[model samples]
Target chain A: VPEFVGASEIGDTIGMVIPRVDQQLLDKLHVTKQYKTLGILSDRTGAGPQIMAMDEGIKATNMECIDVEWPRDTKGGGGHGCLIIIGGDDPADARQAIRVALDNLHRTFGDVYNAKAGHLELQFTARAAGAAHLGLGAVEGKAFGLICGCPSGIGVVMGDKALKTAGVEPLNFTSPSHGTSFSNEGCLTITGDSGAVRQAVMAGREVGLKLLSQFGEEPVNDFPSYI
Target chain B: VPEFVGASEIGDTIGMVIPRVDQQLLDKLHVTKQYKTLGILSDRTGAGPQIMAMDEGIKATNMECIDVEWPRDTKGGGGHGCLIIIGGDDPADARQAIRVALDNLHRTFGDVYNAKAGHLELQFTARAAGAAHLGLGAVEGKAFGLICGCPSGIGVVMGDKALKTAGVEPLNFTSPSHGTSFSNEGCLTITGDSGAVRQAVMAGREVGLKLLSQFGEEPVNDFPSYI
Candidate 1:
């Protein structure tokens, strides 16, 4: 959108995240005051690099990188592969921070797609961990499994506002991997290369801004939030 | 499946259930030395029958049904259906017990496949709640969605073993509604008539017996498990 990867001057942005947390997990980390949280689902190594990108993104965006967790082994990557990370702060602020992490993936992988047989097969597999929050795909597989116990379930919480604000019925990320995998849940996949990614991230950013400055409040459950 | 409305003598088995509750929900129910907990994914109705089947199956196989949960909603069978139940005293015992619920579906719907235009449509809507555990089509969707917290969460934990003992690489169960659901995933789905269903169930029962009595122990991680 900005330049395949955008300019450094543009700063951090979000990609696809649901923007919510498991009420149960929230309660666990509760008994206190915790502002934001982000969830991520990654293939150990595939996500290896994205981890750095997100960390930097969070830091640059002035957000907290709470923690990370390693769960089950996936079919792809390796046997011992899977990453779940969580991060957060204020809702609006979380958006900016989260977007920054997503955009950073673009900056890191350039929305890499391998063009499998015909269509581009996603090459940024590891970075896809945060996709669940966007309201599409399954974080780790549970259609939005990231919010529960994933320490790194950070970015799994994304938003769909500006698009919806304009009454936009956007496309949810779908993968064609099932073109092969017997266990493929095309609906549970998040991978691809397109403008919608950046466009969506940017919109989430702008929407959060409007919700905060425009509405003059903490954009908590204000807009149509998903987790 | 025996009859669209299988005879009551055949007993209650799983269908589509709205088994809600979350892993986070489980954690709260947790307290350190927790031996095992059960998660049921079901439709409030469809899976309602599977519930009875599972209870019986657990008892028959000598596994623990532990408890149940009411989690979220899905995209199928009205706005109120589909559940994911996780009841595992022993993974192996769970496998046998889970298979029992699946076989019930077989006897229930007889894998009710409506010969669509050319394919077969699935009318088991809410009845599909347990499809994932048995391993097949449409699950991990709304079916399994209500099970885990979504995304980072996953299950209906799939599996395999006996086929009478060694001859069953049998199909799970697929749908026709999606016969055109975008070139659906058909590999893992298992379906068939009465004989096949009974064959699979008996194998599971015997297999669990082998895992426990034959091996003298609680079956946990020894067998082929899917999560």
Candidate 2:
């Protein structure tokens, strides 16, 4: 039998193949570390849970668990209306973990009026799952659908029922934060319609208020004061 | 009566505040667009001469000019290189512009040379200006220095001569490429040992060979061809 020979491949391959890892996937999986959780006390001081559960649903197979405090601002001013979670095996992994955490928050909180929990917002950063080739509306619309847990659900909305009643898409369950230190792990992005986004803000504020009431605490009066 | 009570409490303040429009001075300095001369280029390519000139130097104030080619595979099986010349309204202006551009490129590119470049060894990140912060020679007994005319002249032998010959302080130049695209703008960054970085295969083979030879011609094989 004649020996088979492959066509001689002389040159190396070239051209760009930009990777597009889904932001949702990165946000969901690859968290191998845990970060501190900040809470508000009666005296307007910051307190820490020091640790929270790194929901096993998002853990990476190859990672080893390591825990560290979520970074804090110097003035004891911690995020109140939202939750910031981070974890990862590597920096990229930590970023993805945060995304997953946000997703989980969105699912667990899903526009529910928790008298004790009140309105809440969540933010995180992860390596950009590359750039989105799709239009902003498509991405945001999909996110809203996912958050609302219904095919035609509005992505951003004021109250969960209000959003559903108005037939508008629900807003993102999470709103990623923007800052160099946090984004260093990766890009933090949220996609949704403006109307939906407005609805989400309303939902977050309402939930926050409800949460305060549930805890038998007065809601914060001024935005700048909270800041 | 009220004025009498407050007049004594008011402290006296006096200073000469000269304010002038100086239209003639402003007119004499027309502020017409300024220009610089980048080294003569043999190839015109698709970009207009005006744009090319602007790209080279004339309109590059507060901007950086880099001559980048498509990757080897993308360039129809040819090697690629660039001569990134940074320019500004003043020396300080050029330095600042170049630094910002380099930093931005580093963040965008990640590892200097991605696989698309057909060279496994090239890197496209720039270092900061200061030498003390870099600790070039402190660790691993490496020496650091700068070259007058040449940017990538910092290495064991070349670094020693370039610094000794130029009478300037020891500082590293930045890389001009990263990932698929050339980072032509935004924040500046620096990385790796200047000496070791200068000796990389792609810098010598792809960049040096392409730059030294005349433009519009096939690249010479000074080093082993990875492609």
Candidate 3:
């Protein structure tokens, strides 16, 4: 049986750890069981928290980080969350992983949340454990920053400004874990020294929010309100 | 340069038909040009409107639906919309297809819309042209019904109640075009006579909505409120 952890109040994070999954369920999910246990961590906010937890958890245990499961709207609307599945050779390891992941999730809760129209949410982390998970390994910098812009198309200006304003390196650009956020937000992540990351986020947020303001409400004939 | 069409108020539909695309852009998108013209239609509500339009548009002209692009959160949050891309040998054909598609979109607007927690959105169509797009074909019936339940896990009960209550046959199950709705809804589509389709939707909606209400608000300790 799968031990289903309830959703967290902070980020609405849902977690599950199965000591041994039946073949029937595996077949239904179209996934193969690599070991005796499986741990799944999903967050409605975005993939950042889950990735951070997974990165930290994996370092603590011998676990195989399975691929990230994008939202499957049919199963549940994509806005439900982004998921990370991990496999472990022992049930104890899986439990330990979920515990660590959940703790990490609690620590980083609200790093990404609520996409209001034309809103900008900026998050910064001084010691990011999940940078390698994005396939960007061997980074000398330990700090990271992410900026989310609602209503799409805001990343272009934000990315350009962030790069020019600070010493941060462009890490990755992604949609929120939900893919498109409810308000169609765009995301940009950067890595560098803590000071640089903060400066870059502030710089990007300033310009991105300015651009988003034009499309926020009724004054613009072509704009659609976030509602 | 790619042509851009503004977003439609009805279902918040956005469309574009490019007579020709540059290789530079293709490389950036990591997609190859199969033809001289490309047409794209996206909708914020759900995939139903886009599929319906694509089904009708493809029949009216010689256009190949390359693929359904799942919402890419990095570029835009997944809730932004579900997108369909079509290719054609001639720009005229692409233009005609986009026009027809837009018409279809306008015709069947509001098939799927906002996903509130514990809510159900049910839609029925007498002549569903896009049934083939989901790879379910050779159906004698033209009618279709789709039921969306927010916050996920509603499809199991809904599908069961719907199948038991109506003469409708299961056609296909899918995540909305965005791969998930903003509220993590589940989707189930059935096919049969128009009468049967309608009945199925109503039947599914009744039980699903009832199930959803239990998780809607403050009384439920495990429940997370939908903002």
Candidate 4:
């Protein structure tokens, strides 16, 4: 309803919603043509198996790639790591590539996540979005969760584990006409697909609503940052 | 002089000249006031020493941190991977936290990067500016080579690197009054501090001038994608 929903104020078209698909992201997705930009961002892994598994994972989905390390740490090592693709394909394809790669991580480091690959996760869904939000690959097929910032926009969501570990509450607030922002405080993982924005707002609003509902619907005053 | 120079055409104020400081970026810089978005991002190291180095590095800088992680990767490890802070502080302070952490990585790994700690790098810049000669943050360090796409309205001038890396050599034909884009390209890494944008133009022009020498002075046509 608001012009600002699901898009960037600064206009990178970054988290911008579908239909408005600007040329840049489209090109990056390679939906318009062939691409040489596809790149793999992998963590420094050792014994080569872990990184090897990640590499295997990228190839798992026909995604082509050039290897890249997190430039900040070039120290070659023997360890378990991560993978991020730069020029991934259209939404669904991109999601799958990242998904398969992490799955391989579990196979490579089984039981590391849990005796059952379980980190004891939590899910946040949209009540307002209804069927429009039904399993449309909202960047949450499990593996792609890595790119999703704070799922509930709450850093303390997993406090017991993290005093322990934490889930990035990925939420973004952009001033579509004024500025841009990305927060670990977000509600979904976006591949710039169709309806991506609505899905996010739907879930985010749900989180916001539930959090506020604890105070019995409205705040003592209408002084909430979210509203 | 065109509005698209330095800053992104999408209108993100990434590299906008110092005096052209957009109010939004200025406010975020918060020359005064404390910050809440400030986050700490890092990974654990080996059984003890590596992870120990990471924890200690957080202390190396006095700026506080409400820790965060790369939303994508949740696996544990045996070495220091990397550090990336999000929703950070005054540009300088943010860089210090990450710089120190990576420095400690060197102390832990002891020459793993090409057997050189040379690439041990640190950066604190904006996120969420996108395509177009419109607006964005293009990382242009003295060594990184600045081929910044829309440097001060010039079409493009490459320093050996940016030229070659130029997207599909993605041609972004911009019409002054309207339209938009993005190249596998960009203009500058925008922290938008004091002389950020000028620094980019400063480096870009040097390349521009030298490239111009071959043309006997300027372009054959008054028109140019890169001057």
Candidate 5:
């Protein structure tokens, strides 16, 4: 038989460990508490050996260390790591040093990774005055009606009105507003629960494209069309 | 049928000539630029005999001045007439100044007349997460819907949603998020229309009663229910 899990039994998995100082690496880098630590590793022939030696030294000195492995295919060139040291009573004293070190790292290795999947690509379009008011209601009604018939997925829409009308109170999230002109343009963010997410995105995209068509612009080409 | 009046056909109603030193009132007050003239009045009193005298001086120096009387039952023992001055510079500036000045005058006089209304009598309530989100949507919907109806309103709503979801867009004007917050609790703001404005006392009473009920305390008996 499958055992039932209580809600209380579900615990948080997120945890963080603050790093402590390593005397050997500190001395070798000639960095004080005011300096920040930078961790770098590369998959070069000698690079692995060098990093291993550095890790040994760091571990032997009882200093805190984070593991960072550089991707292979640097093409035989030496890889660099930057660490900043700050002189202060607390770790926060090295903030400026850390910032400068990060800046240097960004200058050196910023373009090394061009992973498109890591970037959040947002598309925005304005809703027509007429459709926005009427069409939104119509679509929302249709969605709700579908949910009523099916009741198989996440049936509710998560928005100010829909949520409120359903009596589902919002969590402590930041409120939205229109401070700039761009704010007038509507947007949609797709995240969490991939299945629910895809549905929301498709719905939003459909509405957005419909609105764009009404505005006399060619529908956006990248988004999938509704059959 | 109403006859069309041309600019040249209409003669200047009145004219006045003052020395450059007297006209310095306009310049010293930074009124040289017509729009900036009202900027000087922002923090200044708009009622009283002194204000009336200044209006007379303004009328005396400009022929195009229209001596518009103040609304009935104004403060500072009653003042007579506002002077409308015209110059050949930017009309927008003059229009802005006139608008601002008129607004300031109404605010000042209205404040004096409503003295017994009490400074803190119209208490402000902090907005909760749910109310803030829903109220903001309601206000945005109302504003856009008033102008564009359903279609336009939906666009505003979607835009608001996108900004919120993406955590990037700026605040809309009607959002209660623009209001203040309380420590140890959530944020809050005022709501409803003019008649409801006066009924804010009822809201305050309800809040007080709710708090008392939660904490198991006695509710105040002497509280007034009117604004």
Candidate 6:
């Protein structure tokens, strides 16, 4: 596992599986001292992938999804990251969950379509594998979908387009204030039949990409420059 | 006032004083409709400077500091930006406050010492001009100081050093979680005798610069790139 330097590499998603608990480490991280093992994942993109990936990881093992730590947005870009905490009964389970979560994040990275000013993250699953951990216990066996857009307003349009285009039922939308991003972002989580879920995610992604294309192509500065 | 595009130019602080209330505009910005006039200031820096600037602005006129909007970290660098909200009895007061705030932000930008990975913001004033608006109403007539750093930990160290070097009384510290940054940043606000506050702010700034210089100089990416 790479060192959690309170930041992540550009376009990179890093995860850690801490098998042993250290009081000093918890104190430094401001994490509670009750957990025995910890799992952490940080990504450069938005929180949609991280949450979806975390749900997948938690269901694969007996670990509990504890908390997600949100650091300030990185300095250069409008990109965001999160610190996920997972507690397992033992170190092995925690480690395995992190591995699975990291793999899912990799797939999510591949699925994302990055534009100049925004991005779309789309994922579809046959079952709500991690719905129980998310307090959606009744959603088991249902097809699930996660669609997100940066600059957020696009996500609103995408959600409207996706709902009218597919049979999926919308679960929730995380606007910038509700979502993990300090930047304005929109995220839609939906569930329904497998095919319908996939269709909705795809519909949202396509429309989101088109909306993002409307922004001008001026090169934005990475850091604040006193003009 | 440049348009608030959910982003700001690097090193620039933009402000707007809307004399009239527009319901549509409030809806768009998710701002409450209670305000008749709106004053907004956006800066491409940490919240410390922004908050300090807002205090100055609020004190200059009969305006109220309503809210400060925290956007996501910019996508390219670990840089951050914020939206400040000020409401006044009339457009004239709101506009005046914004002007003063923008000027203070400009000075803060000038005062900052930017490094490869971090920066410092130091401010000192003769009276706790905005203390009342900041819920420190009892602090009137006392001197005030604000010291902040990016990557935050440096501010903590700076605070420790400043306390020992001066007779200022600590007001507050906004750690990354409490402060407006999504990135890890630290801010220390102090108040006391005018001379003591000045000494504390200067002490913190000097030490923080030395600490920031220890990091190796490598061009960090503005946005997250998958390695």
- Using TM-score as the measure, which candidate wins? 6
What 10-residue stretch in candidate 4 chain A is worst by lDDT?
A111-120
Better of 1 and 6 by lDDT: 6
User: Which portions of model 2 miss their true places by more than 4 Å?
Assistant: A1-188, A191-227, B1-154, B173-227
Clashes of each: 99, 40, 21, 46, 36, 39
* TM-score (C-alpha) between model 2 and the true structure: 0.20
Q: Please identify which of the two predictions, 3 or 4, would achieve the higher TM-score against the true structure.
A: 3
Per-residue lDDT tens digits for candidate 3, residues B40-100, read 8876654555676677787788887765654422122223246777887787787777778
Give the CAPRI rating of model 4.
Answer: incorrect
Q: Which stretches of candidate 5 lie over 4 Å from their true place?
A: A1-182, A187-192, A221-227, B1-227
Determine the iRMS, in angstroms, of model 5.
28.3
CA lDDT, every model vs. true structure:
0.30, 0.24, 0.56, 0.27, 0.22, 0.60
User: Residue by residue across A114-178, what tens digits does model 2's lDDT show?
Assistant: 11112222221111111111111123113322221100001111123233322343222221121
Best by lDDT: 6
* lDDT over C-alpha atoms for residue A30 of model 3: 22
TM-score of each: 0.29, 0.20, 0.47, 0.22, 0.18, 0.51
lDDT of 1 by residue, B1-227 (tens): 22121122222224222123355666776222233434333443233234434544654564444444422122211111334444544545555656666655434333212111001111222233333333223332232111111111111111132222233224332111111121111112233443443354444333323322211233232212111
Cα error, residue B111 of model 5, in Å, equals: 48
Error of 5 at B9 (Å): 34
User: Model 6: per-residue lDDT, tens digit, B1-227?
Assistant: 12122223333444555555444324434443367677766544445456666687777888876555555444444445555667666877776777776565545455566656866667666865552334322265677777777678887999898999977778778776775545566777778877788788778877887788789652232322111
Q: List native contact recovery per candidate, as a fraction of 1.
A: 0.00, 0.00, 0.04, 0.01, 0.00, 0.24
If the candidates were sorted by their lDDT against the true structure, best first, what order would they fall in? 6, 3, 1, 4, 2, 5
Candidate 6's displacement at residue A162, Å, is 20
Per-residue C-alpha lDDT of model 1 across residues A149-218, encoded as one tens digit per residue: 0111111122434234233223342222322112111211222233443344444444333333333343
Tens-place lDDT per residue, model 2, B13-104, is: 00010012122212211122222311111111111111122232322344433222211111111122111222223444443333333223
Worst 10 residues of 5 chain B by lDDT: B144-153
Write model 6 residue lDDT over A38-119, tens digit each, in one string: 8777765545456666777878898776666555443344445666677766877876777777666555455566545555
